[PDB]
Amino acid sequence: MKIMQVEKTLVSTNRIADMGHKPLLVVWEKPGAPRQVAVDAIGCIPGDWVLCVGSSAAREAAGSKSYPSDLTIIGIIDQWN
Amino acid sequence: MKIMQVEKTLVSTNRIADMGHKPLLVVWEKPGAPRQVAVDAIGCIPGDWVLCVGSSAAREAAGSKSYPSDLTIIGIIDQWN
Amino acid sequence: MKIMQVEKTLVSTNRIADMGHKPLLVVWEKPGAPRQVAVDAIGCIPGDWVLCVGSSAAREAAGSKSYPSDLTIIGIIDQWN
Amino acid sequence: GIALGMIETRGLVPAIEAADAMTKAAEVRLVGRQFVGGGYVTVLVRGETGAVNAAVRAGADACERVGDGLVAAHIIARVHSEVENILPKAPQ
Amino acid sequence: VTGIALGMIETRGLVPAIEAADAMTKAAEVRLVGRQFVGGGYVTVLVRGETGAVNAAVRAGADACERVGDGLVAAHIIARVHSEVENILPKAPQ
Amino acid sequence: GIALGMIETRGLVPAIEAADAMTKAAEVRLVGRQFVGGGYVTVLVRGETGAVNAAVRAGADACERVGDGLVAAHIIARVHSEVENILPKAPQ
Amino acid sequence: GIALGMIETRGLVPAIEAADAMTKAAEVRLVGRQFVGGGYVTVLVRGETGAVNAAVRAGADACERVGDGLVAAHIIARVHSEVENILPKAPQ
Amino acid sequence: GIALGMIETRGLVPAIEAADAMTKAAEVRLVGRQFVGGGYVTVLVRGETGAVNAAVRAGADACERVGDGLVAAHIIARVHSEVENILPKAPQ
Amino acid sequence: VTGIALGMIETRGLVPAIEAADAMTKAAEVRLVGRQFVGGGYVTVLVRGETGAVNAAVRAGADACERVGDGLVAAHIIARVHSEVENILPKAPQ
Amino acid sequence: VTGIALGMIETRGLVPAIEAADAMTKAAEVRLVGRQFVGGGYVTVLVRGETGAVNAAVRAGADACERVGDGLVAAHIIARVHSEVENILPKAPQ
Amino acid sequence: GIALGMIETRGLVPAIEAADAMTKAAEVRLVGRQFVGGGYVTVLVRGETGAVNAAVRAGADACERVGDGLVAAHIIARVHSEVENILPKAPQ
Amino acid sequence: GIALGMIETRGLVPAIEAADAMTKAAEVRLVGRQFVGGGYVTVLVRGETGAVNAAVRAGADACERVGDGLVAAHIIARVHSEVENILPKAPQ
Amino acid sequence: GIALGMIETRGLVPAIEAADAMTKAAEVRLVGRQFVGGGYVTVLVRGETGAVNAAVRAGADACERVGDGLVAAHIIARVHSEVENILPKAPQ
């Protein structure tokens, strides 16, 4: 898992129906680092430090074994800087 | 698998219930390297050199086929520097 | 798959029981490159150039569908420099 | 954006969860939380049509299983000028 | 008491809500910030604090009020509240 | 005394009967009557622990059969200081 | 942190394993190991509420299957000042 | 107050939980925690009769389901002067 | 309070023993001379006094503690104690 | 003998514990650092050493003491002990 | 204290036993013993509410099995001033 | 002799009987009597291997039927030097 | 390291495979290959205890399915000084 900071929300209206209703967030390891998009399974605000899991675990973390995700937020770190 | 050094513990109170009771540790390949978070399946102290497995093997190493993990500590290296 | 050179052996006495009896080797793409640990499914000596497979294929290559490995040596290259 | 999204719940806890989920899901503005009466609570957001669509879907998903649950989740992409007189502009 | 996490408990009637508020404040280091009469008999009590404290408080309050009067309706925790929702969250009980 | 007694009823007539019963049964102070909504009415008393116990018992017994009846009867021996902010001080 | 976590086991080996697991899981301080009598052993930790919660959960999970097993795993987020007089401050 | 409250549990974790519950429920003083032997643990409080009644009720309810559970919960309103010699004054 | 008779009550746990001691001292003119933690959960309380007083006290204590906690184990009276046993009998409760 | 790994064996009674300690110390290069009377019949013996030595010692001790007296309760190994637990671990047998 | 405790028995021996039990159980004042007629005997105590509750409970338990037994055990937390004229002040 | 004999019994009377039996049966030294806890008692002797074998056999036979009986009887011909630190030297 | 590991096989091919697997698995030294007689062949390694454990496990796994198979796989962590006189120091 990686420690990442939530930057902003992301909306894709024509995304595939397999994505369900889950929201999407733009995350990076630090400001200026390469951007990635994660499925928000917790509900996070910009500036939050979050735990993100990839590989096949992200699919089940996002809701189902066949969910189309390779990066899912699974928790907010209590204290981090 | 990767050889990494345990830095410190990590707590996420609002993490998803699929994570169970397993503890989390911050690991890196060396001091100053990018940080990662692993599920501690062994029980390790800071400064320990540990073996970490990713991909789908980390899920089963952490306890179950559907566990939400992509990095799990599976052993402490007997002698390493 | 990656071409890597075997450096030395690695022993973790308290490793999880799911690892079975398989030995572990330290491998790198070249001397001085970042180190990785692979399950030795062939039997290799230091200095050997070997073929290493990752992802979910390493699990089955190491012995079973649920083996905890993300890097397994699956052959020794006949001639390489 | 001038689109409108609203979610109605039974009780205040699912309504708060729905509003939180919507505002976290997209760039929408929470313009009202109305105590309808008899236990109904409605939360309303404004924004661009796609943002409101995403926010309402996420909020309905989040609040479906909280408390006494969800009653309605609706999106109006183009609001007639007459309805703006009954739509609140800021929460209280 | 610091922290920006939010804990909410909804009950049917005021007596279980008061019991839940007492249980939460006794169980953890949280601030009682509001009691709201929703309508139709629903009453909601809200607390603020750190995430762990709010978690413990909400658990204790739900357990305490589940058997009082007409019972418990909802018990929820939000670790981080969006700034938009703070406009509809009460700041002092009054 | 700082103990808290609480009786909730369906309707106002059982609530008034309960308040009369408690205040006659023990030396307690009637500090509030709240219209909760949906027909619930709550009456609150303060006093010493034993007085409040006796008063709540008497009030529940008196109001259990009046009108639509009694919903809850609860005693809190020692109230946390935070909860004091949501309790009325005088029966306005 | 002033929260309190405790784990009770049958025997000393599961208690030691539980204490080790808790202290490895979170930033908590082991303040006592008590031989209760009749085989019971209790280990107590102090720290911030979330840290103690994580530590106690991990310790219970770790010590459940060791020796004669686990008896109790409890967390008290806010300890009354009276109980501090019976809580140990450092192990022996 | 000179009433005496007493809760006996199997193990130390339910005893600590009971002590916390009583001291939070009423204005009572925790005067002792005794390791009886064989796993029994007893916690004693002193205070006014009604406060002690409320505290013992709360402690029994809280500790009945923790660990190996509750053994006894007893209240003595007025203690004979001879019995004071076997009761601790402070929780050492 | 005079008398050299001995009254003993054994219980499982401390709460029934304390209840028995209170009952004995309230019932008769006896002195509470000791509470002993035997081990394994046994607790014994001992009183001294005249034979009739000790008899009444032991009866009352057994009746009172038989239903408290884990209950009563033994209730016995010795009218005259041999001087050898006084070496193992406690003199003050402490 | 160096090493900071910990090996523990719990038995019912002292005779199996002594047999286990003898077996461990004969089987591997470990130091016997303590024998503890837990209460209720439990006895625990603790050894320190390298991880492999402690593993071998604990295996041998469990095998040896499993059939002596009232038997074996627990056999556990901790490769690295947190510094907090060292405060409750004995340093010398005595 | 101005609470009133009352125990009625069939015969004088259970009444005396009940009076002894209440006065030993709590700090209450025995203010009267009345020969009602037909074999009824009533004993009355005054004191604080909790003390009177404990005393009446103890007296009922003690006298329930003595002689012809117990008839009634009642507690009035606060006595109306008119009723004071029919209650004895001292046990003549 | 440096062999070690060990007899564990339930209670002290069988332990004393076993110690008497071993010390009478062979030329062994009684080096300790340990109250293990929970009723277990262990008696330890030292001497030459054959003497210790005879002594342990005699002690087990003698104590097997006394009181609550015998738990274990074990002989270690040669004790590792590390184990000497947990064995008593004199029967205090 | 002074630990000892040995593997016994039926035939020389599984013995050679076992020795190769052990020496490849860990940092151990092959000190002997003994033709026991009747087809038994034994290979012995020395090293640190953990290294020998890993080597023996890997060698047993490797040679289990070769030729007539494996007979024994054993690890002695601490070798008595007497056995060193029958242990070979270097292969032939």
Residue numbers in the entry:
A (entry chain 4), B (entry chain 4), C (entry chain 4): 1 to 81
D (entry chain E), F (entry chain C), G (entry chain E), H (entry chain C), K (entry chain C), L (entry chain C), ...: 6 to 97
E (entry chain D), I (entry chain D), J (entry chain D): 4 to 97
Give passages from the manuscript.
We generated constructs that express either the NTD or CTD of CsoSCA, as well as a CTD deletion of CsoSCA; all three constructs contain a His6 tag fused at the C-terminus of CsoSCA for immunoblot detection. To investigate the molecular basis for these interactions, we evaluated the CsoSCA–shell association by performing single-particle cryo-EM on purified minishell/CsoSCAΔC and minishell/CsoSCA-C. Initial analysis of micrographs from a preliminary dataset revealed the presence of T = 3 and T = 4 shells in both samples, which is consistent with the shell population observed from expression of empty minishells. Notably, we observed a marked increase in the internal density in T = 4 shells compared to T = 3 at lowered contour levels. Despite these efforts, we were unable to resolve ordered internal densities in our cryo-EM maps. In contrast to the previously reported CsoS2-containing minishells, we found no evidence of structured peptide interactions between CsoSCA and the internal shell surface. Closer inspection showed that the disordered internal density in both maps contacts the CsoS1A hexamer but not the CsoS4A pentamer. The minishell/CsoSCA-C map has less internal density than the minishell/CsoSCAΔC map, consistent with the smaller molecular mass of CsoSCA-C relative to CsoSCAΔC. In addition, the internal density in both maps appear to contact CsoS1A hexamers in proximity to their central pore regions, although this remains to be further validated in future studies.
In comparison, canonical α-carboxysomes utilize β-type CAs, namely CsoSCA. In this study, we determined the homohexameric structure of CsoSCA from H. neapolitanus and investigated how it is recruited into α-carboxysome shells composed of CsoS1A and CsoS4A shell proteins, as well as CsoSCA encapsulation in the context of Rubisco.
